[PDB]
């Protein structure tokens, strides 16, 4: 519905901060794993024995 | 005459063709507007008028369709370019526009009349009243008239080395007509192309004529050979207009220093 | 249609708020998990229980 | 009152907000006083036909619409997007009066988003049209006993007209596939037909003189403002202003803005006209709302004592003291001028 | 048919930056460090 | 994550500069072009 | 390296900027200026407007 | 094709002529067109009512197609 | 509406005319002229990032 | 008015321009549907009470 989008454009920038909040949440989720797991600078390998 | 058809040329529009979308003053803000605009780096026609074959008339004045707007511009030196006549069908029946530049008068005329096969103006004043009205026979039913100061305030070339860059954007919406202009000299013209610079176009008149316009025609101002009818060297550019979204950057003084398109490229959309 | 748009927009805003609250809770849990990993896997912790 | 308790514990409390009430009101309008020629439009001997509706250009004049309300006892004045009295009150820039004559059956066709033979063929209104339509009976004025044929209306055309577009086409209609370039038998037809107004018809078929006004309210130059007395401008004071209908309260001061000749209204980051141009003798002016802020109380507790201290949040003491007779809100609520020394904190 | 309905209403899911294989590699590296080095690898060279 | 256009994939490993998703990251490296890895 | 403090400052500034720019939203209204509406619409319609 | 098609073609053609006379700004010629056309609608209402439509009573038609 | 019309295996009963999904929106429609069942799906849109 | 007639109309094509071009005097106040949109989209059941 193009006309619905046209009339929604009059509502101002409301999807901007919603998109920003969702992107920030996604980045936070990525950083959570990056911080909890990537705590070693080297990938140590167990010996064959 | 038996003029031979010339191949159309194209030129990059660059970052040209931006005008103030409203009378409201904004300073030090990055405003985004949705209006008719000329896309950045767009192909624009490169019509060039000159005395071909060293004395043969060149009728490079085609009936360019108006569509939604034009970006008429030139690197004109002296007053040889005149006339921005419009017309739906370009006959006696159809009501049509008329914009002469006789000396220092625009004389905006909206009347329906017949048009000559090759309308033109005479730059030199007629001796001893003037035959400059050869473009049309006589107006029949006149609806609107407007006389004012000339649309150009540029000084004459004098010795030379400098030419004007009169840029015009014509917009016809909701039974209205609007005019924007801006002039500036040019330093080097070896490629004969629009400079890679930013220029802001300001409104100067609004025409409330609610007329159907579908074709655009331009005229020339040549008096006589100095065989037949000849003129000097000149060129004008036309750029078609389509709806676009533009982000305008106002400075402290309120002029548009630069602007960025929204659909030219992914970087532009990101901006 | 404005009534419908307002309702849908409010529903989206409520969903975003719930997502933000859940993201804050998950971030707290991830910070606790990272602290536990650092203090128990990378070393021996004298903290009781 | 804020805590809803007769006893207040010690601490800081935010009660309300203080605002400098305007000292007076000033109205600024263009000083041109010539009356607009609306009487000529509404009193013309004969109106133009509907297909070729006349367009009238109105500028640099003051228009009093009250004459329309008082006179012409029979009229229809249903208006779009503006109140009548407020229309008399507010300002305009591009006012245009169109006049034509149609029957009383199709008077409703002069409206945005409506279909009909005149609506589609003769005169079309934009969907976002702002302005009034004025219609009145003209059976006495425009109906000869034999018949009135001067008024012509269009009935056939290939495509509908855009809003605010006038067609004076007289070419032969293309009713059929075959071209004829002239009126003939099978299918040639003619685009516009004629009226036959006579007094003997009923009210539905009686002629009606319809006048429509085109209005746009951006009002940057505001050359056709209505009848309003212009008072002397007041600078550097919280005074109500009426610059070309821009009702509001604030402090007007000289501006460093370099307005371009076409530019008339200044604005800010968020849709606030912080700069205005005087409709009178040219003067670029800034608009700033007069001093406001939060009001806080530093009571040490009701039990300990009734003495209180007031903290005005984020306002310089010099320009907004307590002893000014301007009565900056709550006239009875006022601290003593020199009860204690006034301390200016960050 | 459940994810498709949400996707058709503009409700997409962004994949995580770290795949399961990389998380498993991190866990294996942590196991190797805590087995072959104790707590020394957590405060410098293993 | 999806379809990537404008970058070249290389059989090399580097630190993540621009996180694309699912273990792919992009960077501006050597003439000069955007590389995904 | 002070990403967190500048990030918090940017969040606060962006929230304030969004809140002040939200006044440009028509929300489906005839205009975004209360004074203009009160100067052109009658109170019966200006109330809902 | 009976007679209604021809009658309405006659109506449209003489309405076009009425427009011609009105634009020509000559009164009597338009008035005689008005009498002729009103006689035409009288013929229309007579024919639609079931009564036979006269042919010689109405003025001689032009070279209609 | 706007979408891609394809063949549908969703067996419409003789009285059945329309067809919805879990998302409480129309998903299938029967042709008003021929007794043919179609499922309407929006053409792929996705999202773009730079 | 007390014994208002009820007429059932169905399985037919409806054109509402007859009420528009003809019947010069009327009152076409309508609820829940635009007049042109009344004439445009498909209905199923119409009840006529006079
Ligand atoms: C272009 O201009 C000519 C000249 O006026 C128009 O021709 C005139 O058209 C009108 C209406 O069709 C008529 O004028 C009438 O003429 C009679 C004398 O015949 C005179 O009493 C009035 O002046 C009256 O208005 C007439 O056909 C014609 N006038 C003449 C003198 O030939 C023509 O209509 C115009 N073109 C358009 C498209 O309007
Ligand atoms: C302005 O006039 C042009 C004719 O030059 C109109 O274009 C016609 O439009 C109809 C319907 O859109 C088509 O059926 C015709 O074929 C068009 N004519 C030609 C020559 O192509 C146009 O509709 C008019 N109005 C505008 C542009 O608003
Ligand atoms: C350009 O042409 C217009 C129209 O032809 C000239 O307008 C004339 O203005 C004078 C003075 O206002 C009038 O007395 C004439 O009636 C106008 N029309 C004419 C002469 O046809 C205008 O003067 C011309 N420009 C210059 C510089 O002379
Ligand atoms: C805005 O306007 C000011 C005021 O004129 C400009 O400042 C002048 O700039 C010129 C050269 O650019 C100097 O010669 C003057 O001395 C300046 N005057 C003042 C008062 O500063 C300024 O350049 C304009 N443009 C911008 C972007 O500020
Ligand atoms: C049109 O003309 C009439 C009279 O020809 C104007 O009527 C005015 O008001 C009353 C009539 O009841 C009388 O005082 C005079 O007839 C007029 N007085 C003045 C001061 O004009 C009417 O104002 C004119 N204009 C319209 C109707 O718009
Ligand atoms: C512009 O015209 C030239 C001339 O043929 C052509 O090569 C080029 O592709 C055109 N560019 C655009 C954007 O149309
Ligand atoms: C009237 O207004 C004009 C506006 O340009 C101004 O120039 C002129 O001085 C004013 N005159 C008076 C008497 O106010
Ligand atoms: C104020 O508080 C003190 C502390 O409890 C109490 O003893 C005293 O009675 C209070 N004042 C009054 C007037 O009750
Ligand atoms: C208050 O205003 C006075 C006079 O303008 C000035 O001297 C003083 O510095 C101002 N104080 C503050 C805090 O701005
Ligand atoms: C990169 O690896 C792929 C395996 O997916 C292989 O097909 C390709 O040839 C390799 N390219 C180079 C340059 O090693």
Numbering used by the authors:
A (entry chain C): 746 to 794
B (entry chain A): 22 to 149, 151 to 248, 256 to 300
C (entry chain C): 993 to 1041
D (entry chain B): 301 to 646
E (entry chain C): 848 to 893
F (entry chain A): 647 to 676, 689 to 695
G (entry chain A): 944 to 992
H (entry chain F): 1 to 65
The authors write:
Guided by these general principles of molecular recognition, we introduce a protein design approach based on the critical importance of the fully buried patches of the interface to drive protein interactions. Overall, our surface-centric approach captures the physical and chemical determinants of molecular recognition, enabling an approach for the de novo design of protein interactions and, more broadly, of artificial proteins with function.
We applied our surface-centric approach to design de novo binders to target the SARS-CoV-2 RBD. A cryo-EM structure showed that the binding mode was nearly identical (1.4 Å backbone RMSD) between the DBR3_03–RBD(WT) complex and the DBR3_03–RBD(Omicron) complex. In virus-free assays, we observed that Fc–DBR3_03 had comparable potency to that of imdevimab (REGN10987), an antibody used clinically, for the wild-type (WT) spike and bound to the Omicron strain, whereas RGN87 did not. Importantly, Fc–DBR3_03 showed a very broad reactivity to many SARS-CoV-2 variants, which is attributable to the sequence conservation of the targeted site and the small binding footprint of the design.
